[PDB]
Amino acid sequence: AKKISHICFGMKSPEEMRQQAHIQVVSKNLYSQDNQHAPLLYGVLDHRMGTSEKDRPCETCGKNLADCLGHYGYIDLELPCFHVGYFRAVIGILQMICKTCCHIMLSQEEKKQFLDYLKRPGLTYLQKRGLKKKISDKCRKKNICHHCGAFNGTVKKCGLLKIIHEKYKTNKKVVRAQENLNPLVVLNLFKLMNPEAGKPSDLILTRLLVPPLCIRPSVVSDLKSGTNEDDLTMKLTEIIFLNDVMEDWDFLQLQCALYINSKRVDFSGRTVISPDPNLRIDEVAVPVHVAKILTFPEKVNKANINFLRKLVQNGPEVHPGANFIQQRHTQMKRFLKYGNREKMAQELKYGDIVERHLIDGDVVLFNRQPSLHKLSIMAHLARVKPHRTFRFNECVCTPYNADFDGDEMNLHLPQTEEAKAEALVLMGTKANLVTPRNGEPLIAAIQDFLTGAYLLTLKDTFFDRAKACQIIASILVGKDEKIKVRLPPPTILKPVTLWTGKQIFSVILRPSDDNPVRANLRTKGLCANDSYVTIQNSELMSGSMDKGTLGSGSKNNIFYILLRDWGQNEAADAMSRLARLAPVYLSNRGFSIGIGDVTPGQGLLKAKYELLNAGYKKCDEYIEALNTGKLQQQPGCTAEETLEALILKELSVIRDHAGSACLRELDKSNSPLTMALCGSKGSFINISQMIACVGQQAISGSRVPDGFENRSLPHFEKHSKLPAAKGFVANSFYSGLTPTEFFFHTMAGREGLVDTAVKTAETGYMQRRLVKSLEDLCSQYDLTVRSSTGDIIQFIYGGDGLDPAAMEGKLEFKRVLDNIKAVFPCPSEPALSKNELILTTESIMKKSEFLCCQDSFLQEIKKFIKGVSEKIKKTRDKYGINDNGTRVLYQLDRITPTQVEKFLETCRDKYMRAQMEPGSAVGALCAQSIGEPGTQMTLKTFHFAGVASMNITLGVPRIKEIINASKAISTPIITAQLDKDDDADYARLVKGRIEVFLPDDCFILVKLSLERIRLLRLEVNAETVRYSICTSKLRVKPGDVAVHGEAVVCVTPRENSKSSMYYVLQFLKEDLPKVVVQGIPEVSRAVIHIDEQSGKEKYKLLVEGDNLRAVMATHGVKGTRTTSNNTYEVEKTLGIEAARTTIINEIQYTMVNHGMSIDRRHVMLLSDLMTYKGEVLGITRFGLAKMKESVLMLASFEKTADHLFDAAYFGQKDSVCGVSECIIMGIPMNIGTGLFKL
Amino acid sequence: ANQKRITTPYMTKYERARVLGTRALQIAMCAPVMVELEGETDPLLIAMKELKARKIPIIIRRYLPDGSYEDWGVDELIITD
Amino acid sequence: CTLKRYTNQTFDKVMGPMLDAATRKPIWRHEILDADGICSPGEKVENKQVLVNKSMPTV
């Protein structure tokens, strides 16, 4: 009928509290003390009063232990005591009632405030007490504008004391029981105005009531040794001596304050992980002794009873069996050590419910930490294989980080079959291979599958018909693949018939298919071809695989050519034929990195020694120079350590030369060469640190600083930078190193131990906070998002309505051409110049998706661009059929009406499939999309950056600043263009436009270096200096205007006559600093970028001072392109969607650093969350003043503290009522689809 | 209740998977059993039998809090593909 | 087995299981201990047998 729909905390319902009363105070002792025994006493700690022992007459519930819900009972004590919380309230707000009159809060008034209070939401009535915070009892009694002033009473903050004299105020105070007030008058004056909920009267600490004994456990040792309980409020029973009876009230409340005021786990398991690839991609396997973990519903069905009884007879010590089976009469019976059972009347003895072991999925879940993606816990199969590892198809170690130190792993057990079927067919085959956070596959040949398959593909490898052996672990193989195989023909008929290595890879002979690919990891032109693989319909024309053509690439794979066309269930079964085909080829070929794999020849060691000589020579030349400077630095700007950038890039030239010497003579029959030719394991900058030159280390994108005075290490000479005294190793790990090249290795080595150790400092907070703040997002079927009150967040997903789930090749106009390439409808030929026939097919197109429409707005917006695309295809075909044909009919230039019709049908299919709402659950996906890409990558992105200045400022921790929008941001950097398309001088004039002598005595103030210094710095004037010094003649202290000074060609600023003979101090300082030489009147340094980017010469202004409108008078400008990098400032200075776009791009600068390109629609959704009300209040980690958002995020102050207790004592509601509470509260979700109303 | 125009000619995957789950409970209490009662005859794989339904004679009704009851028979629209 | 002592009542003398019933002299409770229920230097004590017991009259 109805479960919980709206529930909050619970309290003492006084009636049902006190009918269950048994004893308040029986005697001076409890726990059956005087009996010298303990049968059961005394009537309150027993029977029940809250079911804290094995059994007794549970009150209103039954029976023990659970389902005896906490039983109440009057245990009143009547100790004199009052509201400690309202003690503090009366002390603070200073007698808010205006005692002892309690007259009406307002008078007439102005009923405007009356009606405003009566027609506004809650959490606001505090303003009335705020108005009367001070004026209470100090006003005109029975007057207008209020009714207080009665009776001269203000409260004193004497700790918890509330002393209310008949105050003047501030003239009537006493010290010892005089001029006091009693809280009883406060109680009477009750007898912010709302006694419906906010009653301070009934909270009197005289009828105290107890929570039930279900809070308290008592560990009765069965030995009468220790029965401690916590805390609890009943303990004051021992104060019966004082129970017989203003400072006395304070003493009583002090005595009170001692004891009055201040989805985890189910069916689990954890072991270590070491997998197999024999487990088909969907399947997984567990240990065997997890079947010894049980008590499953598996409720018996009529078709199942016999198959269940088969295993019921086994019992405690057989794997396929049963144990603890739940019986019909709710009295479950065991077959464990007390079994001696299993007669099993064949249809009724367990006619309701049974419980077996893990036989076949029967899905299980696997835990990982941290759970970067939602794909760190997925749904996958079972059965059952032993050797208590966590074995699974080793192509999917990437989204788990199933690390192999032997560090353990956690397994679930779901024992409910309601959404288990839903779980197993939604996040089991579509979760694995396609992520919305990136759009890139997670499942991939992790390792040697890559190199084994590569080696197969290598143009060398020639095979045998006798090598149909390794074929047969793939397509003549384990379960669910044993059809035949068509024996790819004898692809040589020489004196020596032989099988090339490729169509031994491209082997399967059930459910024939079609495919296409290109663009592997090599160069262009037939260049010993390791790229443009060009797979046709399941054969392998050219090429050789790679991590970008057989692994977790982007658009060319065995997925995005075998997930889209042809569907699912043919990608999770070509990965298995690889998993058993390729890595059981290496076991017949062997990889073995010896030493000669990492020894450079003794015929090209020269190219390291001579370059060391040349490099050290030029670095020494410059380092000598910086004392004389004949070259010279300045330029650079600066130049003190700008003989840093030059030496940095000289050692960079050294390492580049060395590297390129590490990768030329390597004979191609080599290891790591063949683990970087294939993205398999390691790169081209690790076949260089092992051969020639591991230099140069750094610290923070800069060589090793000092730490002894002016020298890095003491094993060196003072003040002498060089490629040795400031870390530059030069010894390859082959000829390893020297003890002044190791200790500069464990100080850039201690980055990857501090990088990966304060990575989990910001991410640990921000991930959980983003999840906690962004749950309510839903995707109801109107293509529009809605909120906790159904407030519109979007209307489409950006016109398209699309979301990154179905991001097929380029969306979907280039790969599908290849898709229909591979299925050839032969009959057609060039006779009529089919361009016009292509236009006729465009006409049947125009007809065939004007039957489009459904849940729509996703096809018309792109239907015309589709038409334009086929039109340009027809134009290209016309050009080709004209020039190329100006006889195989030029390959027939294939295009046929059938192909284009199939093409448009596929286009419609994918365009209408990629449609979100209906659905769609777009929120948390975007939340984690923006979240975890801050967690993964910080290594090769923010440190190259090696090594140069000029505009590389921040990376991932800018996410913190964007989300929080905190004003303590130390980079308020405000970019803006200029007279942009110009030369250095042309924009330099405006750059200059953007923007110091002896003070004397004897009736004279100062002078200025008004000489060509200003005339070559920036256009100002001595008159400008006079104007500036006229402005208040100081900052923040009362100097003068003095109207005026500077009566000479160079300023004579006329120190105003010593009216304040105190100070020549301000007379000096207030003129000493800059007044007309700041360029914004509140800003740090300006910046200039005379830089040649985008071909031409760009010129910007990287100003660092809030706020915008600083670019009013930059007569450059370029006002169209003015931008900012601070959300709250651009909120008020510029437009609303301007700030939305700035928030979009700001989080899209923290992710351009290398790799990571999260979906633009995710940051679009976050920005839509930013600007519900237009006025931009971005989602901060502490709260927002945006009522259409979720009020739950407000409560998450990181974390809950005494403030909620204080609000509770004030009768204020709590804002933890979002949907993250639902998981602790255990109720069904209701949004989008969980709101069923027939 | 002919407010059924704002759904693509496909049910969503979440709804389809959950209706498969509730059909699982149906055929897992005693029997609503269908076109082949137990032709697929196997031990305790409760879910993996009614996955093979392909007819599904049942109705599901999808909404929006500011909208009416967009109803849908399972028969009258296309499937997971 | 931190065999305590107590002020008034005593663990002192109270050592020794070996009920010695029929099955496992007596049972996988006290199957493998010894004459004095304390020791067993070399026996594959298994899966929640008794390594040592003590009647525990503490207070």
PDB file of N, CA and C in Angstrom, chain A residues 267-312:
ATOM      1  N   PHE A 267      26.475 -10.082   2.747  1.00  0.00           N
ATOM      2  CA  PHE A 267      26.809 -11.242   1.916  1.00  0.00           C
ATOM      3  C   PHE A 267      28.086 -10.994   1.104  1.00  0.00           C
ATOM      4  N   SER A 268      29.207 -10.917   1.812  1.00  0.00           N
ATOM      5  CA  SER A 268      30.439 -10.447   1.189  1.00  0.00           C
ATOM      6  C   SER A 268      31.563 -11.481   1.295  1.00  0.00           C
ATOM      7  N   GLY A 269      32.763 -11.056   0.889  1.00  0.00           N
ATOM      8  CA  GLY A 269      33.955 -11.883   0.907  1.00  0.00           C
ATOM      9  C   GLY A 269      35.153 -11.206   0.270  1.00  0.00           C
ATOM     10  N   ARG A 270      36.366 -11.491   0.754  1.00  0.00           N
ATOM     11  CA  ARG A 270      37.556 -10.858   0.196  1.00  0.00           C
ATOM     12  C   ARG A 270      38.741 -11.816   0.170  1.00  0.00           C
ATOM     13  N   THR A 271      39.422 -11.876  -0.976  1.00  0.00           N
ATOM     14  CA  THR A 271      40.619 -12.691  -1.170  1.00  0.00           C
ATOM     15  C   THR A 271      41.543 -11.967  -2.151  1.00  0.00           C
ATOM     16  N   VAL A 272      42.626 -12.649  -2.548  1.00  0.00           N
ATOM     17  CA  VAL A 272      43.630 -12.104  -3.458  1.00  0.00           C
ATOM     18  C   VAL A 272      43.264 -12.481  -4.892  1.00  0.00           C
ATOM     19  N   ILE A 273      43.850 -11.775  -5.859  1.00  0.00           N
ATOM     20  CA  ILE A 273      43.451 -11.843  -7.260  1.00  0.00           C
ATOM     21  C   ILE A 273      44.627 -12.299  -8.126  1.00  0.00           C
ATOM     22  N   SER A 274      44.370 -13.287  -9.001  1.00  0.00           N
ATOM     23  CA  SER A 274      45.279 -13.774 -10.039  1.00  0.00           C
ATOM     24  C   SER A 274      44.486 -14.511 -11.122  1.00  0.00           C
ATOM     25  N   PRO A 275      44.225 -13.878 -12.278  1.00  0.00           N
ATOM     26  CA  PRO A 275      43.165 -14.348 -13.173  1.00  0.00           C
ATOM     27  C   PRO A 275      43.585 -15.334 -14.254  1.00  0.00           C
ATOM     28  N   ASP A 276      42.627 -15.682 -15.107  1.00  0.00           N
ATOM     29  CA  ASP A 276      42.803 -16.531 -16.272  1.00  0.00           C
ATOM     30  C   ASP A 276      42.220 -15.783 -17.460  1.00  0.00           C
ATOM     31  N   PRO A 277      42.680 -16.061 -18.683  1.00  0.00           N
ATOM     32  CA  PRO A 277      41.911 -15.628 -19.850  1.00  0.00           C
ATOM     33  C   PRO A 277      41.011 -16.712 -20.425  1.00  0.00           C
ATOM     34  N   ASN A 278      41.007 -17.889 -19.790  1.00  0.00           N
ATOM     35  CA  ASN A 278      40.146 -18.979 -20.228  1.00  0.00           C
ATOM     36  C   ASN A 278      38.697 -18.695 -19.877  1.00  0.00           C
ATOM     37  N   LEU A 279      38.468 -17.673 -19.057  1.00  0.00           N
ATOM     38  CA  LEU A 279      37.128 -17.280 -18.661  1.00  0.00           C
ATOM     39  C   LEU A 279      36.552 -16.329 -19.698  1.00  0.00           C
ATOM     40  N   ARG A 280      35.534 -16.792 -20.424  1.00  0.00           N
ATOM     41  CA  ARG A 280      34.954 -15.997 -21.496  1.00  0.00           C
ATOM     42  C   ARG A 280      34.599 -14.605 -20.973  1.00  0.00           C
ATOM     43  N   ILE A 281      34.633 -13.621 -21.878  1.00  0.00           N
ATOM     44  CA  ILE A 281      34.670 -12.215 -21.474  1.00  0.00           C
ATOM     45  C   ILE A 281      33.577 -11.876 -20.478  1.00  0.00           C
ATOM     46  N   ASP A 282      32.356 -12.345 -20.717  1.00  0.00           N
ATOM     47  CA  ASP A 282      31.278 -12.067 -19.780  1.00  0.00           C
ATOM     48  C   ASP A 282      31.474 -12.835 -18.480  1.00  0.00           C
ATOM     49  N   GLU A 283      31.919 -14.085 -18.573  1.00  0.00           N
ATOM     50  CA  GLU A 283      32.078 -14.916 -17.394  1.00  0.00           C
ATOM     51  C   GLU A 283      33.178 -14.380 -16.483  1.00  0.00           C
ATOM     52  N   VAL A 284      33.100 -14.792 -15.220  1.00  0.00           N
ATOM     53  CA  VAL A 284      34.125 -14.606 -14.203  1.00  0.00           C
ATOM     54  C   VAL A 284      34.150 -15.884 -13.368  1.00  0.00           C
ATOM     55  N   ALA A 285      35.034 -15.938 -12.379  1.00  0.00           N
ATOM     56  CA  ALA A 285      35.036 -17.073 -11.474  1.00  0.00           C
ATOM     57  C   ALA A 285      35.540 -16.629 -10.110  1.00  0.00           C
ATOM     58  N   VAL A 286      35.157 -17.400  -9.099  1.00  0.00           N
ATOM     59  CA  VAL A 286      35.358 -17.074  -7.691  1.00  0.00           C
ATOM     60  C   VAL A 286      36.143 -18.227  -7.076  1.00  0.00           C
ATOM     61  N   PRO A 287      36.490 -18.200  -5.791  1.00  0.00           N
ATOM     62  CA  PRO A 287      36.970 -19.425  -5.142  1.00  0.00           C
ATOM     63  C   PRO A 287      35.859 -20.458  -5.031  1.00  0.00           C
ATOM     64  N   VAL A 288      36.207 -21.609  -4.463  1.00  0.00           N
ATOM     65  CA  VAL A 288      35.207 -22.644  -4.232  1.00  0.00           C
ATOM     66  C   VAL A 288      34.612 -22.556  -2.829  1.00  0.00           C
ATOM     67  N   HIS A 289      35.402 -22.143  -1.834  1.00  0.00           N
ATOM     68  CA  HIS A 289      34.925 -22.036  -0.459  1.00  0.00           C
ATOM     69  C   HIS A 289      34.075 -20.794  -0.221  1.00  0.00           C
ATOM     70  N   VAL A 290      33.638 -20.121  -1.288  1.00  0.00           N
ATOM     71  CA  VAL A 290      32.555 -19.150  -1.173  1.00  0.00           C
ATOM     72  C   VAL A 290      31.193 -19.819  -1.271  1.00  0.00           C
ATOM     73  N   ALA A 291      31.122 -21.036  -1.814  1.00  0.00           N
ATOM     74  CA  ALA A 291      29.905 -21.828  -1.727  1.00  0.00           C
ATOM     75  C   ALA A 291      29.609 -22.257  -0.300  1.00  0.00           C
ATOM     76  N   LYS A 292      30.621 -22.278   0.564  1.00  0.00           N
ATOM     77  CA  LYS A 292      30.410 -22.487   1.988  1.00  0.00           C
ATOM     78  C   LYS A 292      29.927 -21.220   2.682  1.00  0.00           C
ATOM     79  N   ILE A 293      29.472 -20.240   1.904  1.00  0.00           N
ATOM     80  CA  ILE A 293      28.899 -18.998   2.402  1.00  0.00           C
ATOM     81  C   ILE A 293      27.514 -18.857   1.787  1.00  0.00           C
ATOM     82  N   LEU A 294      26.491 -18.767   2.637  1.00  0.00           N
ATOM     83  CA  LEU A 294      25.154 -19.211   2.256  1.00  0.00           C
ATOM     84  C   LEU A 294      24.026 -18.418   2.903  1.00  0.00           C
ATOM     85  N   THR A 295      22.863 -19.063   3.006  1.00  0.00           N
ATOM     86  CA  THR A 295      21.595 -18.504   3.473  1.00  0.00           C
ATOM     87  C   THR A 295      21.055 -17.427   2.535  1.00  0.00           C
ATOM     88  N   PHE A 296      20.633 -17.882   1.216  1.00  0.00           N
ATOM     89  CA  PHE A 296      20.058 -17.454  -0.058  1.00  0.00           C
ATOM     90  C   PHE A 296      18.550 -17.710  -0.107  1.00  0.00           C
ATOM     91  N   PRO A 297      17.739 -16.781  -0.605  1.00  0.00           N
ATOM     92  CA  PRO A 297      16.318 -17.099  -0.806  1.00  0.00           C
ATOM     93  C   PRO A 297      16.063 -18.154  -1.873  1.00  0.00           C
ATOM     94  N   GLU A 298      16.510 -17.913  -3.112  1.00  0.00           N
ATOM     95  CA  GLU A 298      16.270 -18.799  -4.253  1.00  0.00           C
ATOM     96  C   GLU A 298      14.914 -19.493  -4.190  1.00  0.00           C
ATOM     97  N   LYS A 299      13.849 -18.731  -3.943  1.00  0.00           N
ATOM     98  CA  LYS A 299      12.551 -19.283  -3.564  1.00  0.00           C
ATOM     99  C   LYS A 299      12.081 -20.357  -4.537  1.00  0.00           C
ATOM    100  N   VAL A 300      11.747 -21.528  -3.983  1.00  0.00           N
ATOM    101  CA  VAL A 300      11.397 -22.694  -4.786  1.00  0.00           C
ATOM    102  C   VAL A 300      10.275 -22.362  -5.754  1.00  0.00           C
ATOM    103  N   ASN A 301      10.405 -22.860  -6.977  1.00  0.00           N
ATOM    104  CA  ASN A 301       9.360 -22.776  -7.979  1.00  0.00           C
ATOM    105  C   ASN A 301       8.941 -24.184  -8.372  1.00  0.00           C
ATOM    106  N   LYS A 302       7.783 -24.286  -9.027  1.00  0.00           N
ATOM    107  CA  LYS A 302       7.231 -25.601  -9.341  1.00  0.00           C
ATOM    108  C   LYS A 302       8.112 -26.363 -10.325  1.00  0.00           C
ATOM    109  N   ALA A 303       8.659 -25.673 -11.324  1.00  0.00           N
ATOM    110  CA  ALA A 303       9.520 -26.333 -12.298  1.00  0.00           C
ATOM    111  C   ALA A 303      10.883 -26.694 -11.728  1.00  0.00           C
ATOM    112  N   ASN A 304      11.196 -26.245 -10.516  1.00  0.00           N
ATOM    113  CA  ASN A 304      12.546 -26.363  -9.988  1.00  0.00           C
ATOM    114  C   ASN A 304      12.700 -27.423  -8.907  1.00  0.00           C
ATOM    115  N   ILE A 305      11.597 -27.895  -8.317  1.00  0.00           N
ATOM    116  CA  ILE A 305      11.653 -28.603  -7.037  1.00  0.00           C
ATOM    117  C   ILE A 305      12.606 -29.793  -7.103  1.00  0.00           C
ATOM    118  N   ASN A 306      12.524 -30.581  -8.177  1.00  0.00           N
ATOM    119  CA  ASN A 306      13.379 -31.759  -8.295  1.00  0.00           C
ATOM    120  C   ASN A 306      14.846 -31.370  -8.433  1.00  0.00           C
ATOM    121  N   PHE A 307      15.139 -30.413  -9.318  1.00  0.00           N
ATOM    122  CA  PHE A 307      16.512 -29.958  -9.504  1.00  0.00           C
ATOM    123  C   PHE A 307      17.078 -29.363  -8.226  1.00  0.00           C
ATOM    124  N   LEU A 308      16.212 -28.840  -7.362  1.00  0.00           N
ATOM    125  CA  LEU A 308      16.652 -28.308  -6.080  1.00  0.00           C
ATOM    126  C   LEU A 308      16.928 -29.429  -5.089  1.00  0.00           C
ATOM    127  N   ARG A 309      16.009 -30.390  -4.992  1.00  0.00           N
ATOM    128  CA  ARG A 309      16.212 -31.530  -4.107  1.00  0.00           C
ATOM    129  C   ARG A 309      17.460 -32.317  -4.466  1.00  0.00           C
ATOM    130  N   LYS A 310      17.878 -32.284  -5.735  1.00  0.00           N
ATOM    131  CA  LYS A 310      19.124 -32.949  -6.111  1.00  0.00           C
ATOM    132  C   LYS A 310      20.285 -32.480  -5.240  1.00  0.00           C
ATOM    133  N   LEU A 311      20.417 -31.167  -5.064  1.00  0.00           N
ATOM    134  CA  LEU A 311      21.474 -30.614  -4.229  1.00  0.00           C
ATOM    135  C   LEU A 311      21.088 -30.498  -2.760  1.00  0.00           C
ATOM    136  N   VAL A 312      19.796 -30.543  -2.430  1.00  0.00           N
ATOM    137  CA  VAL A 312      19.398 -30.453  -1.026  1.00  0.00           C
ATOM    138  C   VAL A 312      19.973 -31.613  -0.221  1.00  0.00           C
TER     139      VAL A 312
END
